[PDB]
Scaffold this active site. Structure first.
Site, PDB file in Angstrom:
ATOM      1  N   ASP A 155       7.219  -0.025   7.296  1.00 35.76           N
ATOM      2  CA  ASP A 155       7.416  -0.716   8.489  1.00 35.76           C
ATOM      3  C   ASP A 155       8.827  -0.144   9.190  1.00 35.76           C
ATOM      4  O   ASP A 155       9.617  -0.228   8.481  1.00 35.76           O
ATOM      5  CB  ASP A 155       7.168  -1.941   8.949  1.00 35.76           C
ATOM      6  CG  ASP A 155       5.941  -2.476   8.256  1.00 35.76           C
ATOM      7  OD1 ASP A 155       4.856  -1.819   8.574  1.00 35.76           O
ATOM      8  OD2 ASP A 155       5.777  -3.311   7.440  1.00 35.76           O
TER       9      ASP A 155
ATOM     10  N   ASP B  84       0.671  -1.384  -0.066  1.00 39.06           N
ATOM     11  CA  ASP B  84       0.071  -0.146   0.103  1.00 39.06           C
ATOM     12  C   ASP B  84       0.906   1.226  -0.077  1.00 39.06           C
ATOM     13  O   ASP B  84       0.320   2.481  -0.053  1.00 39.06           O
ATOM     14  CB  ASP B  84      -0.944   0.028   1.073  1.00 39.06           C
ATOM     15  CG  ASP B  84      -0.456   0.087   2.595  1.00 39.06           C
ATOM     16  OD1 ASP B  84       0.940  -0.056   2.764  1.00 39.06           O
ATOM     17  OD2 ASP B  84      -1.081   0.378   3.644  1.00 39.06           O
TER      18      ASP B  84
ATOM     19  N   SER C 105       3.134   2.113   2.480  1.00 41.54           N
ATOM     20  CA  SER C 105       3.417   2.563   3.588  1.00 41.54           C
ATOM     21  C   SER C 105       4.761   1.722   3.747  1.00 41.54           C
ATOM     22  O   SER C 105       5.315   0.901   3.184  1.00 41.54           O
ATOM     23  CB  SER C 105       2.528   2.018   4.758  1.00 41.54           C
ATOM     24  OG  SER C 105       2.270   0.452   4.591  1.00 41.54           O
TER      25      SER C 105
ATOM     26  N   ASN D 221       4.302   1.031  11.618  1.00 42.24           N
ATOM     27  CA  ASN D 221       3.729   1.263  10.308  1.00 42.24           C
ATOM     28  C   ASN D 221       3.420   2.746  10.137  1.00 42.24           C
ATOM     29  O   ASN D 221       2.905   3.235  10.887  1.00 42.24           O
ATOM     30  CB  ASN D 221       2.553   0.332   9.612  1.00 42.24           C
ATOM     31  CG  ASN D 221       2.330   0.482   8.309  1.00 42.24           C
ATOM     32  OD1 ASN D 221       1.328   1.278   8.043  1.00 42.24           O
ATOM     33  ND2 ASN D 221       2.923  -0.223   7.211  1.00 42.24           N
TER      34      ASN D 221
ATOM     35  N   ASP E  36      -4.881  -0.166  21.329  1.00 44.34           N
ATOM     36  CA  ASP E  36      -5.675   0.173  20.421  1.00 44.34           C
ATOM     37  C   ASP E  36      -6.935  -0.389  20.376  1.00 44.34           C
ATOM     38  O   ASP E  36      -7.923   0.028  19.558  1.00 44.34           O
ATOM     39  CB  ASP E  36      -4.967   0.747  18.912  1.00 44.34           C
ATOM     40  CG  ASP E  36      -5.772   1.514  17.959  1.00 44.34           C
ATOM     41  OD1 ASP E  36      -6.050   2.474  18.343  1.00 44.34           O
ATOM     42  OD2 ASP E  36      -6.213   0.863  16.989  1.00 44.34           O
TER      43      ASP E  36
HETATM   44  C1  LIG Z   1       1.804  -2.735  14.232  1.00 47.18           C
HETATM   45  C2  LIG Z   1       2.247  -2.602  12.859  1.00 47.18           C
HETATM   46  O1  LIG Z   1       3.195  -1.966  12.421  1.00 47.18           O
HETATM   47  N1  LIG Z   1       1.749  -3.783  12.225  1.00 47.18           N
HETATM   48  C3  LIG Z   1       1.939  -4.201  10.899  1.00 47.18           C
HETATM   49  C4  LIG Z   1       0.594  -4.162  10.106  1.00 47.18           C
HETATM   50  O2  LIG Z   1       0.717  -2.575   9.372  1.00 47.18           O
HETATM   51  C5  LIG Z   1       0.711  -5.279   8.931  1.00 47.18           C
HETATM   52  O3  LIG Z   1      -0.231  -6.141   9.124  1.00 47.18           O
HETATM   53  C6  LIG Z   1       1.929  -5.954   8.597  1.00 47.18           C
HETATM   54  C7  LIG Z   1       2.892  -5.125   7.436  1.00 47.18           C
HETATM   55  O4  LIG Z   1       3.817  -5.457   7.054  1.00 47.18           O
HETATM   56  O5  LIG Z   1       2.779  -6.123   9.756  1.00 47.18           O
HETATM   57  C8  LIG Z   1       2.548  -5.533  10.864  1.00 47.18           C
HETATM   58  O6  LIG Z   1       1.770  -6.434  11.669  1.00 47.18           O
END
Ligand SMILES: CC(=O)N[C@@H]1[C@@H](O)[C@H](O)[C@@H](CO)O[C@@H]1O
Ligand SMILES: [Cl-]
Ligand SMILES: [Cl-]
Ligand SMILES: [Cl-]
Ligand SMILES: [Cl-]
Ligand code: NA
Length: 129
Positions: A52, A48, A50, A59, A101
């Protein structure tokens, strides 16, 4: 910085992650193991757009600002680069908001798939805590 297992467990404990939201220290070390392999500089780009960041792979869609995730939020009010520091304070403080959350540590897919329901205490066994 690539943390050692017991070294990270000590740092997470000092920052109040142990039993935070009811998750024992072993859960947090296990999550970091499979999210980042204990590397504060870990990054991963998602489909998408984004990214991490850090030892808990937080993220940019929701939690930090990197200026390249259109329409995202910055709920932890930090640049994502802060999550790559050798000092894990920012990552820990943001992980506290994430785990509060509503879905607990299921917010980390690697924790649900590789830690949840396993013998997570093994990740702190033999550490001087
Ligand atoms: C808290 C966090 O960053 N969770 C992320 C989530 O955005 C997604 O399901 C995936 C992305 O690679 O891995 C992680 O679980
Ligand atoms: Cl534990
Ligand atoms: Cl952005
Ligand atoms: Cl630290
Ligand atoms: Cl929970
Ligand atoms: Na963001």
């Amino acid at each position: 910085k690539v943390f050692g297992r017991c070294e990270l467990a000590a740092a997470m404990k000092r920052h109040g992650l142990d039993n935070y939201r009811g998750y024992s220290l072993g859960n947090w070390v296990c999550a970091a193991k499979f999210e980042s392999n204990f590397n504060t500089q870990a990054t991963n780009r998602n489909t998408d757009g984004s990214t991490d960041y850090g030892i808990l792979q937080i993220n940019s869609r929701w939690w930090c600002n990197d200026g390249r995730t259109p329409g995202s939020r910055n709920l932890c009010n930090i640049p994502c680069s802060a999550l790559l520091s050798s000092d894990i304070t920012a990552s820990v403080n943001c992980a506290k908001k994430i785990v509060s959350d509503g879905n607990g540590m299921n917010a980390w897919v690697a924790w649900r798939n590789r830690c949840k329901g396993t013998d997570v205490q093994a990740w702190i066994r033999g550490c001087r805590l």
